[PDB]
Amino acid sequence: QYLLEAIVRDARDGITISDCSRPDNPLVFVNDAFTRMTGYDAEEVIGKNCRFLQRGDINLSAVHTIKIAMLTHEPCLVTLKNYRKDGTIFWNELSLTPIINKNGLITHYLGIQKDVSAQVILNQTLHEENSNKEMLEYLVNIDALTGLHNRRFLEDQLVIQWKLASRHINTITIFMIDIDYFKAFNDTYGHTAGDEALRTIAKTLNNCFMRGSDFVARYGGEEFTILAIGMTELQAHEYSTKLVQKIENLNIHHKGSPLGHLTISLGYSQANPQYHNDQNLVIEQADRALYSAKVEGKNRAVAYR
Amino acid sequence: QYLLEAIVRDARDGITISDCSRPDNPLVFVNDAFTRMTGYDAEEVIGKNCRFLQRGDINLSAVHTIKIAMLTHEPCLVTLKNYRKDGTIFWNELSLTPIINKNGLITHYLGIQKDVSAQVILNQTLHEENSNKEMLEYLVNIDALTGLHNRRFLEDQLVIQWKLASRHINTITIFMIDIDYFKAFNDTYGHTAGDEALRTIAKTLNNCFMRGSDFVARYGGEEFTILAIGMTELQAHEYSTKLVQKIENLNIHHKGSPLGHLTISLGYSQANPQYHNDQNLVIEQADRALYSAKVEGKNRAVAYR
Ligand SMILES: Cc1cc2nc3c(=O)[nH]c(=O)nc-3n(C[C@H](O)[C@H](O)[C@H](O)COP(=O)(O)O)c2cc1C
Ligand SMILES: Cc1cc2nc3c(=O)[nH]c(=O)nc-3n(C[C@H](O)[C@H](O)[C@H](O)COP(=O)(O)O)c2cc1C
Ligand SMILES: [Mg+2]
Ligand SMILES: [Mg+2]
């Protein structure tokens, strides 16, 4: 079905195509959903870089992840605060993906914009009290404190995405994240401040993913977990290293930590689900790597190898 | 770009293809986003009708709109309450669209599932008090009482979709909806009950659209407006008639109304934006048709002809 391309083109998420042969990656195609979501007609944006949606309040770390990914010819999934032409604000989960036809590497770039404004505002109001049956059905797979997905969402997605990865021969990578000296932060600074530090770390981790299937969840009271698909070994090592550095650059003053700032120990394990098809083995390996990452660096990512 | 089909296939909204040559319209294709959103692997659903997501609490009017649209070989946009395989609940805005290749009418059907759970729960909590800067930025284009889009969203979309319709030679149809004897409902029953009747009518109108670009907005205190694209004259007459009948079937007891139940006067006007390119003319024509619909039937849809 070739018309399927044209019918999916008329979607509710923005679809943009940008030429990579030309400098600054100008937008070469814009669907109807993009103009409806942003207010910018196609005649106004064709041949221009899509940074007009950004303003001075944009997350510098997310835009930097976009730039690095495009220079390294790698996909990325970021959540951005974009402004429409009228001046209104909408939260955009942008997925960038290269286009490679017969080794024609990165001929163009695919940008899928999804209006996630309601999700951001609702999840932010979840840590406050703010009863409703439909709200409780939503909170089943959402942690109230951080607003991220819960351990149930991780384990269910682990089964689903394992079957999907074994079909397309894609890798499955699980990152076990633990806060260092968290009991010292709760005893000295306070338990409420530890919850505020949990939110700040959660908000920092829940961005700058590599692909749309990837996500972060809160596994324990101080533990987080990230699931990623289709990453090589080098990309997994860089992604895990940069995550530990991002929490370090937050520089939340921790008196109990010998480093002076709260850090993150990361232990990740990558596996090919098509070979062994053994679930929960990756989590066990990632938890053993997290244990090794505690004493090895206490502010580092250790791969179970 | 032919790989663009495969890259868009890996989206965050579910993509399903169903064969129409076979009875009950069995699902013939399922993307990764569908299994992640619903928990149903492809091996479990291929060759089956997608009604397994529905349960006894599903909106009967929305499922009936799906059935009628598929039998009439027409697209539809409905919001449904679907259940995942694990038992959790997610709100699904499903867009169905036929596939016609070289007059190969309705060879298959395209089903795009979009998780709009957060949007439903947030907009429902908007009529309650429930401050936040980001929430106020969202409430710019949202009416607090009904939860629908506001008059600003309608007028801006009217400019955007007018340019889009003139590009693809698509029709633009505007429906002017007004509540009959609304002051009699507020005086006798009460102003609060009139607001509850506004929500019930708004919740009924904000569903069972024909295409993903269509929407409903609250134009005035008792006035609603619907924008639709690509509808013929017969489809616009049936859609406007069925909307007046849906509010009538709600049967909210109105003592001041001679019919015994509150009704809806509808005055719609369809135009081809490529010809005249005169905005606000359709709204003026639709408002004159609404005035004629008041005295002509008081519970009918009148087309400005
Ligand atoms: C196809 C494509 C679509 C894009 N769409 C958006 C967008 O919708 N919102 C946004 O904030 N950035 C978007 N960008 C990213 C910006 O255009 C820009 O490349 C990014 O901000 C990095 O550039 P800069 O660091 O020089 O500002 C898109 C990029 C590409 C390639
Ligand atoms: C391609 C396609 C995808 C569908 N996906 C869903 C869905 O995700 N959720 C849902 O409630 N109904 C979905 N449906 C509609 C149901 O499969 C079914 O056709 C509809 O409920 C009407 O059938 P019924 O009245 O006999 O139950 C889909 C239909 C088609 C053709
Ligand atoms: Mg710890
Ligand atoms: Mg009236």
Numbering used by the authors:
A (entry chain A), B (entry chain A): 4 to 133, 138 to 312
Please give me the paper's original passages concerning this structure.
Here, we characterize a LOV-activated diguanylate cyclase (LadC) that offers precise temporal and spatial control of enzymatic activity with an exceptionally high dynamic range over four orders of magnitude. The blue-light sensor used in this system is a light-oxygen-voltage (LOV) domain, featuring a canonical flavin adduct upon blue light illumination. Here, we present a blue-light sensor coupled to a GGDEF effector domain that features exceptionally high fold changes of activation upon illumination. The name of the latter domain refers to a highly conserved sequence motif in the active site of GGDEF domains that enables GTP coordination and eventually diguanylate cyclase activity. To establish this pronounced activation, the enzyme exhibits a two-stage activation process in which its activity is inhibited in the dark by caging its effector domains and stimulated upon illumination by the formation of an extended coiled-coil.
The structure was solved by a combination of molecular replacement and single-wavelength anomalous diffraction (MR-SAD) phasing. Visualization of symmetry mates revealed a parallel dimeric assembly of MsLadC as the biological unit consistent with its in-solution behavior. Proteins, Interfaces, Structures and Assemblies (PISA) analysis supports this assembly with a large buried surface area between the two protomers (2785 Å2, ignoring ligand contacts) and high free energy of assembly dissociation (14.2 kcal/mol). Overall, the structure reveals a characteristic LOV-dimer interdomain interface, comprising the A′α helices and the core β sheet of the LOV domain. The structure reveals a tight interaction of the LOV domains with their C-terminally linked GGDEF domains. In addition, the inhibitory interface is formed between the surfaces of the LOV and GGDEF domains. For example, Asp44# (hashtag denotes the adjacent protomer) from the LOV’s Cα-Dα loop forms a salt bridge with Arg174 from the GGDEF’s α0 helix, and Glu77 from the LOV’s Fα-Gβ loop interacts with Gln242 from the GGDEF’s α3 helix. This interaction interface, together with interactions within the linker region, explains the inactive, “switched off,” dark state. S7C, the MsLadC dark-state crystal structure superposes well with the MsLadC dark-state SAXS envelope (χ2 of 0.999), confirming the crystallographic assembly as a functionally relevant inhibited state in solution.
